[PDB]
Write a protein that binds this ligand. Structure first.
Ligand SMILES: *[C@@H]1O[C@H](CO)[C@@H](O)[C@H](O)[C@H]1NC(C)=O
Ligand SMILES: *[C@@H]1O[C@H](CO)[C@@H](O)[C@H](O)[C@H]1NC(C)=O
Ligand SMILES: *[C@@H]1O[C@H](CO)[C@@H](O)[C@H](O)[C@H]1NC(C)=O
Ligand SMILES: *[C@@H]1O[C@H](CO)[C@@H](O)[C@H](O)[C@H]1NC(C)=O
Ligand SMILES: *[C@@H]1O[C@H](CO)[C@@H](O)[C@H](O)[C@H]1NC(C)=O
Ligand SMILES: *[C@@H]1O[C@H](CO)[C@@H](O)[C@H](O)[C@H]1NC(C)=O
Ligand SMILES: *[C@@H]1O[C@H](CO)[C@@H](O)[C@H](O)[C@H]1NC(C)=O
Lengths: 383, 383, 383, 383
């Protein structure tokens, strides 16, 4: 057999229940080592470690401790500041780094030992621009959460340079969950079409706030850049007539993915979120799905090269892994059809710039897919 | 008494001369320890270390090595990826981290042991917006270089939501400094009023291709976010009739600052003499000036804290510096009349938001000051 | 094999290489000597002399010294006063005088033993007038350098009487090359269509001054009366948008002429262009081309007239040359397809009023022929 | 005693005895010697040679023959082509040259042994411009015969660049006195104000065709740049009501000048002017006056240089004249006052630029003096 171990750095929430990404990582390794189809002899081992996600030194220490122990891959923390340091450590010591969240990559950063399964926001911004094109929008407003959102929507912000759009870029107030003043100053300008660049939780929050204000009508259209739009309590919004739209990468249409999501929902019920939050119950966040997909993709990559040996690399001396370049290359060339559709990393840099999105809009019966999106092909509306 | 040591994580050069920031750090250390008035019974010693600035692991190792011996304050690197890791290390070990270049601040980063002397772009973008309001501009063409530039100037991009401006965001090519297609696109669109978010090295090149494209005429107006506009060889452009507004925080109008600049030029024994870069020769860059001011500000803060003994801190066992809190508080509330002017740091965060800018513009006799921008009083552009 | 001597007077260069005209004369003599098709049973030798080009006494003394030896034709100086003196001497002694530069001949002069190869500025100025008609110009500013430029383009100056133009004649500042005040006056007068009458060196200087003055835009159109427009380094102006226009008599399009130009450039190896001069390196000026063509035309003329034993001509005795009349008639009626196209001398006067010009213009890909001009056919502007 | 003789080169004529220039030269030579006040012990002797004025070889040979004999100074030919050769010979041999007619000056010709008594056509053109500004002209038609007229009236032609004058440059037909087509073109062009740069005989002819065309009305103003306008037969136009205007340097309004002119007219009894020519009778043209004044200027210069024993310079080998430099300085520093008013030579040029004109216009009588022009003050229009 094998004692292959994957390193995982996740958020530390002592007061609350276990995190979604870490629980999905455990679920994925359990599925991999239980299903007698992938990695028959190899059995995955847990090396979960918890950090605060906002202290790069703690994450660096945890990653160095993991690499000192037997670890074949690092599943990076979902924060830019921590993940940058973690991938720098991994690149220096040659261990592959896997990221399941978007991190702003510096153009001059010469790091090669990292692959991110979150869809690249260049392609996602192109998809949002294609949505804006399809609706014949002229004057639009963008409402982002963090300054990095401007980076996440640069291919859409740059559109008026070449297009005839009219961006009215706004931002939700920081350190405050109240989006009421922004909506108040937004209604005065008659902003019919709005693009929201916030997380699904705060997207639901601002939707509830707008409904309390009576903002949305039959004449208001919303596009959400979050991929967790399907996991929203849209029942208060069924017949309101709002033209809500968004993207979704979790391939819930496939029966296998649906069964996996249902098993996730029934297994993850120790401490569900509060019902008065605006999110459903039988749902899987796209970050958990991407963690599952990442574990499976790394399992596929290691399957083709079974002669690996797990080392005890130390951070004190830069010792590249004996098999770190080959494993990294196979991970970058690994293809797998999983929860978030087809996974294919770009060869130039390790990112998912080729993915299959589904455009889900608010019909009269919940949120239903109205087409697909493929970077090679473009918008594929069928209805 | 005893000697006092400072951190010196700087750029690494293969075979060329030391960088401007490193030389400014050394020059400042020499200035304080050669001056009787500043720290009479105290000697300043430098511990400069060279890194790639794009290897967060290398920066972390250098910071840990410096803190393993006596270092009282780390003047961290000049890149976001490395500066974040060094800042996290300094916060964990309770040593002040003084940074002289801009870096995106995460909204949920709980870091208290860091001071930035770069004029906060939250205020400098407001200054650019005040200029474009002064010139009665109804359409601008904000042009940036790196995606982080969007994070830099966000208070200027959110202007159409409150003003009647028309922004056309554009990005310079990343493959090479060949902006001729971009300048041709700007010329075709009759976009005369342009804002450049670049560096002086890149701004000089962009001006060169703008002259090559005939874009420097009596109709075009360029506003530069660079604070090194005075360091541009504007002889070919001064007679073109084009007015190129900008800013300058380096208080070159003062006589002590001018003398220090002259000494800097005299001691600069290795400068690029190539007559094709578009930059002048006898001028101190704003980054070197900010590093000089950083050393001086930390010197002033040290003078207010006698009996401060520097200990040896190990990254393996997280043990905060005993004198870190008092020294950090003294650095935060430190006022100094340095080369960049008044140096007062904000109290809530560590950023420098209150600074005295000097708006400059290009006339037939060169680049000359045409006013002064102050956050408290706005633009005092009355000549 | 009858021997033959060709007299020539050229500029005296105190140091370095000799003038381009003397090099062209020597190269043409060598080419005729090595070619057996031209002048088969004969030979050509040269008797080059050097003068200041401004001392008519020196030119007269050199011409008399050459006439003391047996010379068949004198290739006189390229300056008005010295050329006039040598032409009078040759007309008195009966030997032909071959001149390749424009020189004002007074109306009542009766000299017959002289022929000119420079395109007469009564047909060429008519070509600039035809270009002005084609461009539909209504306001034109003619800018010349020397006082003899008005007498040169007199047919262009006398245009408003017979057409509808707004000539605004201006003169380049004498004793200096800095035309910044003149260009500022032209810009203040909104004079966008300018016809420059200056040498290619001064043309390049004025182009540099206008680029520094912001006059290199799509608004400004410059017509150059110089025939060496191909020798200007238009790298900084091709992308500006100026539609620079001019002529080129040098038949560079031909393969034989291109081969001869390449041979001349390879043989030159002398007088490298100044880095900031603004001219090109491997291009031959039209003056050297006309000297080469003059030697070839006189070789053709003497080919048709064998047994011409050149005798000694005494200036003091003043005995006309025995073969002078018929040899000069043959030169005047000679025909030759040389470097500067077809070389046909007028019958009434010896000037060259019949020539083919290649109207070239500046595009984004450099200068390239855009039409053809012929005194009989007129403009044939077809790109 | 100390005998000094002057050499002169004039026109060769066969019908008339000798030209007016030589008449004035002989009159001056045999007047100064008789007047014992000027040159008490130095008899002036004329050495007259006659040339074709269009053969630079003949003029050069005659000048060399004269310089072989003892000659203090050469009174060069009244042409513009042989005068250049003679002045070059004089400069090379270091002998003063005196020119009484205007010839085109090469910009870079380094000659310092010539003085031109003809009022230079750079102050005369400014006088014409001041005269047309005084009359408040807007449409001006410049007419000339010799192309060199463009070089002469270049300051007048360069007027539209500064002011609003609309110059319409025209040229009289060459080799033909039937100027009717030009006058018809004027009639069809409705050109009312004309500036004639033609000789007095040609001016009278042009006035004759104008009267034949009925163009001597009250709406037609004629400015004549010629200084011999007072010599015209204006009786047939005296009551025509025209506004004919010109200039007059020949100070006829002086007792001594009037007596000298009367004596010259009395001596001129060999060839009366043609009765049917439009010219007066018994008058002295400005060229003869300039020659007479030139001889007196040289006499004043030699007054202070009484030791200049003439030499026997040969043209075969150039030998500078020992007395040439100081005699030339005295020539250029002689403020003699004669028929053409105050005679002062420009130190940096040698030409006469500071002269005193007297504006004359047609009235009920013949050409009364209506003003005075000086280069320093300006147009002193008193009338
Ligand atoms: C909103 O607009 C979309 C765009 O076609 C449409 O499919 C949807 O039915 C609309 N919803 C309404 C009108 O409630
Ligand atoms: C959409 O996708 C299908 C298959 O996924 C493909 O055959 C088709 O060409 C695409 N485009 C359109 C417009 O249907
Ligand atoms: C001069 O600067 C002003 C800014 O007040 C600008 O509006 C104008 O276009 C400039 N003039 C030029 C570029 O000729
Ligand atoms: C602007 O500056 C001038 C000169 O420094 C000063 O007199 C004036 O009071 C200032 N105005 C302000 C600060 O509002
Ligand atoms: C050619 O010149 C005209 C001006 O007559 C100008 O309008 C046009 O743009 C020019 N063509 C170019 C620059 O390609
Ligand atoms: C212009 O030149 C072309 C040759 O390219 C010729 O065919 C055409 O006839 C010419 N047009 C004239 C002479 O009008
Ligand atoms: C002009 O002529 C008058 C004639 O009386 C004279 O008094 C005056 O001094 C002259 N000059 C000026 C500048 O008026």
């Amino acid at each position: 057999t094998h004692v292959l171990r994957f390193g995982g750095i996740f958020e530390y929430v002592e007061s609350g229940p276990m995190g979604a990404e870490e629980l999905a990582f455990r679920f994925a390794v359990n599925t991999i080592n239980r299903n007698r189809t992938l990695l028959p002899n190899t059995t995955l081992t847990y090396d979960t470690q918890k950090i605060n996600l906002y202290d790069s030194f703690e994450a660096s220490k945890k990653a160095c401790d993991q690499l000192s122990l037997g670890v074949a891959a690092i599943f990076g923390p979902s924060h830019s500041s921590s993940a940058n340091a973690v991938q720098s450590i991994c690149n220096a010591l040659g261990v592959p780094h896997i990221q399941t969240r978007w991190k702003h990559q510096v153009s001059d950063n010469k790091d090669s030992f990292y692959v991110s399964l979150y869809p690249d926001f260049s392609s996602l911004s192109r998809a949002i621009l294609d949505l804006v094109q399809f609706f014949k929008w002229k004057t639009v407003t963008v409402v982002y959460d963090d300054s990095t959102g401007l980076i996440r929507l640069q291919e859409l912000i740059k559109a008026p340079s070449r297009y005839n759009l009219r961006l009215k870029i706004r931002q939700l107030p920081a350190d405050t969950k109240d989006a009421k003043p922004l909506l108040k100053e937004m209604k005065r300008g008659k902003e019919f079409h709005v693009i929201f660049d916030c997380s699904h939780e705060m997207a639901a929050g601002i939707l509830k706030q707008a409904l309390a204000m009576g903002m949305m009508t039959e004449y208001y259209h919303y596009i959400f850049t979050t991929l967790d739009l399907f996991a929203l309590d849209v029942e208060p919004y069924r017949y309101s007539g709002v033209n809500m739209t968004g993207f979704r990468i979790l391939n819930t249409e496939n029966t296998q993915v649906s069964s996996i999501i249902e098993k996730w929902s029934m297994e993850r019920l120790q401490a569900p979120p509060k019902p008065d939050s605006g999110l459903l119950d039988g749902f899987m966040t796209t970050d958990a799905a991407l963690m599952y997909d990442a574990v499976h993709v790394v399992s596929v990559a290691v399957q083709q090269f079974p002669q690996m040996t797990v080392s005890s690399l130390q951070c004190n001396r830069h010792k590249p892994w004996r098999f770190g370049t080959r494993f990294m290359s196979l991970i970058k060339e690994a293809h797998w059809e999983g929860l978030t559709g087809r996974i294919t990393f770009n060869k130039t840099n390790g990112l998912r710039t080729d993915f299959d999105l589904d455009v889900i809009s608010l019909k009269e019966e919940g949120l239903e897919k109205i087409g697909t999106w493929d970077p090679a092909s473009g918008l594929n509306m069928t209805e």
